Design goal:
homohexamer, little secondary structure, 0% helix, rod-shaped
Amino acid sequence: GPPGPPGPPGPPALPGPPGPPGPPGPP
Amino acid sequence: GPPGPPGPPGPPALPGPPGPPGPPGPP
Amino acid sequence: GPPGPPGPPGPPALPGPPGPPGPPGPP
Amino acid sequence: GPPGPPGPPGPPALPGPPGPPGPPGPP
Amino acid sequence: GPPGPPGPPGPPALPGPPGPPGPPGPP
Amino acid sequence: GPPGPPGPPGPPALPGPPGPPGPPGPP
């Protein structure tokens, strides 16, 4: 028989962890 | 002929987005 | 024969990279 | 001192994963 | 001091729910 | 006065939307 249809999209991967602390504030 | 084979994999999962910003910097 | 089954889901992808640096330090 | 401004919107959450397979074709 | 810093980004949210059932199968 | 405090959180992230349809059904 003919091949079946493509499967469905993969699930979305998750967002990453938080970034590093920010830089110093005003002088 | 016999029943056909499975289709291929679905479209790619998308790579995960970047995480949130880090916390504020030091004073 | 009839067509085969749909394919597998797309495979899982890598959760995103760390976020950017945080805000500047508070005034 | 005065309270700071509001932060920005949280990032949009992700779409869900694919739904389940469809039902049998017509009898 | 001067006006405080901006608040945090809004909190991350949940992925969405699974999608609809797929299309009906073949005759 | 003391330093201005952080502002309020930004708007919550929006709830993720539904996923894609599932794959087609079988005969």
